[PDB]
Amino acid sequence: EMSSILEERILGADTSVDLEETGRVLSIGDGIARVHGLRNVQAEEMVEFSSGLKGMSLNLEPDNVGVVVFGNDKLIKEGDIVKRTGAIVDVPVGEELLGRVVDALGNAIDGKGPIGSKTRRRVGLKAPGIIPRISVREPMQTGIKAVDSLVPIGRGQRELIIGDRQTGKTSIAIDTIINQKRFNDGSDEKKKLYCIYVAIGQKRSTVAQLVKRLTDADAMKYTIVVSATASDAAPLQYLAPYSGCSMGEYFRDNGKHALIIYDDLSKQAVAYRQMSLLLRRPPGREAYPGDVFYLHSRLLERAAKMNDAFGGGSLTALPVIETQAGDVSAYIPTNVISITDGQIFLETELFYKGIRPAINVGLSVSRVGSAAQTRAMKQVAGTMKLELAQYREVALLSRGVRLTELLKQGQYSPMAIEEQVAVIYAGVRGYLDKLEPSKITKFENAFLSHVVSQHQALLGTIRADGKISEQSDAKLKEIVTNFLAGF
Amino acid sequence: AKLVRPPVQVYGIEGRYATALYSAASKQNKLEQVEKELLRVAQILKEPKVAASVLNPYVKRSIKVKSLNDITAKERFSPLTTNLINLLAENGRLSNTQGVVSAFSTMMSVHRGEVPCTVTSASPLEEATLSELKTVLKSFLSQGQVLKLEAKTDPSILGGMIVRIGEKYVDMSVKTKIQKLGRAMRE
Amino acid sequence: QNMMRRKEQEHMINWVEKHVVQSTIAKCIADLKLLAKKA
């Protein structure tokens, strides 16, 4: 149509010209531009090349400025003009990013038009100090039985998902994102969790698959997907986690609660190493720069729970780390493990032995723990944790196998906390030792069906009260006894 | 002792020696004499016979130092430039000589107040319009400034003019406007 | 319908861009005048 392209597309275009402060490309190569001039450029300031490309000035040196290019250096030649933008790198933030797939700088890559964003936020902001924070109390529900019961996560926590390749880390993150739909459509506003998935160094078709999976479950309406894939410049993959963290800090600072997944931080470390080695900064261990720990700690400190004076919002962080051959002792894995508030260790042996999700409950710890659980979940899960430990000590034994086969879960099926509590109750009270370990799984399905067909009252009770009462204890007791008699 | 820094900065071996000479000459306020003497020694060494003899690594350093002493005393050079060439020949940085000169030159270029000015256009501009352009661009500078204008021509901008005054930059080429219209229509 | 609109609009943009390029000292006059208003 000749109206959508000319009514204001040309009528309003900011045709004015300005007196620009510029420099001149001395050299260009491998995404690094050494630029003469640019006297008044700031450190980490965003500059613009004469071909529309943008870069960030990282090495302020006496005779040149080292600029990392946010794109392909094919379009930059020696002698090109580099204009200042006067601003430190920032990205659009707000509610208008929900449902959109954007790149590391906030440009929509989903072919749906521009993000109608009016607020912008720096990517390198400082984390909140001691005073604005308060203890982590509200639970972040993942929908995964093993996590929600034995490695609970609160709102404002940093829980690391660490494991080998193809162990099920992205599956945990996506289950957690899908789970928040029960709360994001409800009426309680302080229970809604807006999700953010940062894809760093991934295949682009993998991100397309993930967005398809999130749209199938209708989870995209409250999810921002930041995508800096394998073909994107190393600066963009370096900057994607900070852009996502700014998009989440917007919610954190407004009384809302957000969840961010960094999938994964090993590839961000690789991209940062590339940028640093090409900026001629001296290498350290495994050629990584000296400040890779600072790279990840200044990022993972921005996940926080705020007190009431600052809105009461939160930002939960689920960084992902891929280890080689199970070497948790590597450089970046140990860095991120020392940073975060706990880890969820996934194993290949546990994966192939049928334990899915392959969470290693022996190693998986949540430094927040029961402080961020519901009372009902705590009641059942303290006993379940004790019995699973005692089973691991001798692997009674039949109850232990029952609980193990009860921790298994399908993919893309995050259960509600009430149904989780009912299942763990049925498993921890003896109602599962009369059945062989093989059939346990199917019973659960049937059980859930029954409970979600004719017993919505007890589930609503558990949901509202948060704890089980002795009355409701007896109710669910008799329900599960009758169902086991009929099963 | 405190060193006098030149108005512009140059780095490397050439920049360091040029800063040294600029400080040592501004102390004795003999900048123009050493400027002309550096041009003289540059024209001297650029001559191919000397440029081949004293730029030779398989002849002794002291022999070339003595020949440089000869060629700087015989041409009536100030003690400043004399022991400057002696220092260059002692450290072995004779190959950087021209560079030093160049550095020194551009220092004086901004000590006289000469700002570079590039005016790129699609076609050779008109002379009266060029005079008006120089006149109006005089207004972009402070006192004691002079445009050193080089109106190179690039016909790929399709019209207008791209002006760079030192590091200030106005992009009035019509191609920039058309690319902005394209980006506006596509976004 | 949506695809037709999208492709037709894209070719319209391409054609307008190609055809404005084919189409004055007044340009330089206004350029010098605006550089005078640079303050």
Binding site: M2 | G159 | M12, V16, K27
Partner: peptide, 15 residues
């Protein structure tokens, strides 16, 4: 105003 030239002339051409 060559941008307005683009606008007007190419609108009348596309029409």
């Amino acid at each position: 105003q060559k941008l307005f030239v683009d606008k007007i002339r190419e609108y009348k051409s596309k029409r």
